[PDB]
């Protein structure tokens with residue numbers, strides 16, 4: 001059949017996808033800006049397709065309910081055919097790779113610790129040994145799942161702590177986790193992907209810091225339904241953009257070129 | 264048909280694959296040790312196959328001759344059906360991904376600079392602006408090809424320098440590049456994968472250093488012939504080993520646990 005416009009699913013998460021300040025004046029894909037907006041355009045240019053950016057209906061990345069076996073989030077949109085491709089800060093994981101296809105990584109990352117400046121914490125082990133400084137994750141997604149599933153002693157101890165800590169240590173959004181770090185006078189540390197930690201460290205009021213080594217070594221990938229023809233071309237496009245240096249330029253653009261916390 | 268023993272191709276490169284000191288007493292896969300030997304065993308355990316380790320006949324990673332269109336190295340062994348899987352420090356690249364399949368990365372790496380301690384160089388830009396300190400790469404493989412193909416101004420200038428520098432700045436093996444750094448009194452710097460640089464920095468006589476940021480962000484992958492059934496299972500195995508923390512333990516084992524240059 002004839003070519004059809006490709007339906008892209010993504011999520012509003014700065015600096016990946018944001019509504020432009022003047023979005024009300026605009027229409028279609030032009031309403032949005034960010035790293036993943038630019039990445040989508042570069043992939044589409046290389047692969048020769050037209051596309052429509054859509055925002056995932058349920059605000060989730062992708063997990064399977066143990067009872068109903070239903071997949072939610074952007075992964076679910078692909079599984080059920082509601083989108084053709086997901087272009088987002090979506091972690092490549094085994095359980096997702098069993099049900100959708102991922103490109104090779106377009107970013108590298110790992111779980112990391114965000115502190116308010118001056119907090120006396122340098123590592124996950126430091127957090128795990130104490131309770132005065134509370135710590136947690138998003139309430140959905142791969143960071144939470146890392147702790148829930150870990151059999152590594154330190155991380156399993158951290159999960160047991162997080163499940164039982166009061167008040168709740170989980171947050172609904174990145175913005176909520178960052179604000180909680182900023183408002184808690186050093187008594188909350190936030191476990192989040194290193195990419196996001198690095199971005200926030202260069203945002204005013206310049207009161208957060210990434211500390212410690214990353215806890216793991218993962219990647220974000222572009223996702224397509226299993227067996228999708230688009231998958232081969234998109235994978236090769238990611239590799240080409242990486243090899244040309246364009247992914248490095250794009251991260252610099254959205255993370256550092258307009259950093260707010262000095263040179 | 265019945266299951267058959269899987270033919271693995273690999274390459275002798277420390278610390279990935281080495282003949283054991285007592286190899287003459289041993290036979291079969293037990294003759295070898297290293298990171299990729301252990302990785303092969305872990306993948307085979309998870310996927311449930313028996314295998315034979317073989318050493319790539321031509322000593323190469325994988326490139327295509329522009330005239331004959333023939334693929335050499337471990338990639339070629341897969342393309343031509345002489346091996347079933349390659350388990351080695353083999354970089355995921357676009358041109359290889361067009362002809363073979365790669366798992367998701369089992370290691371992350373980028374091109375990096377090795378100096379003799381005390382050499383007044385901190386970056387690729389520093390190298391590119393001068394000629395007193397000579398610099399080069401392996402004479403085959405992805406590091407050389409990065410420079411040959413780069414359209415980035417600094418790296419293209421470095422390639423033009425390397426092609427014309429005298430005496431030749433290229434080396435045949437990692438051991439030769441390391442020895443050249445060690446023997447050249449600061450007048451040779453070696454461009455090599457960060458993984459190898461990190462390994463050598465913890466080897467006696469403890470006279471080399473990794474300097475500067477990495478020039479790129481890549482991965483090593485396990486390779487199979489295009490469309491091979493083994494590919495899906497091996498990809499999921501890599502993801503599982505990563506998610507269990509086993510790849511991190513394996514790098515620590517072969518890089519740092521017996522490092523020779525202190526704690």
Ligand SMILES: N[C@@H](Cn1c2c(c(=O)[nH]c1=O)CNC2)C(=O)O
Nearest residue numbers: 061089090091141142143192193
């Ligand atoms: N990439 C994850 C989702 N996610 C994200 C952040 C995080 O700190 N933790 C997390 O889990 C920050 N941006 C996305 C997934 O794919 O579930």
Ligand SMILES: N[C@@H](Cn1c2c(c(=O)[nH]c1=O)CNC2)C(=O)O
Nearest residue numbers: 324352353354404405406455456
């Ligand atoms: N991974 C490369 C081969 N290679 C290697 C090293 C290097 O410094 N440069 C390079 O090119 C060190 N160990 C392998 C490929 O796949 O061609």
Ligand SMILES: [Cl-]
Nearest residue numbers: 003004005006
């Ligand atoms: Cl259409």
Ligand SMILES: [Cl-]
Nearest residue numbers: 012017018019
């Ligand atoms: Cl927004």
Ligand SMILES: [Cl-]
Nearest residue numbers: 266267268269
């Ligand atoms: Cl057999």
Ligand SMILES: [Cl-]
Nearest residue numbers: 275280281282
């Ligand atoms: Cl050896």
Ligand SMILES: [N+]
Nearest residue numbers: 097100101102
């Ligand atoms: N997949």
Ligand SMILES: [N+]
Nearest residue numbers: 360363364365
């Ligand atoms: N491939």
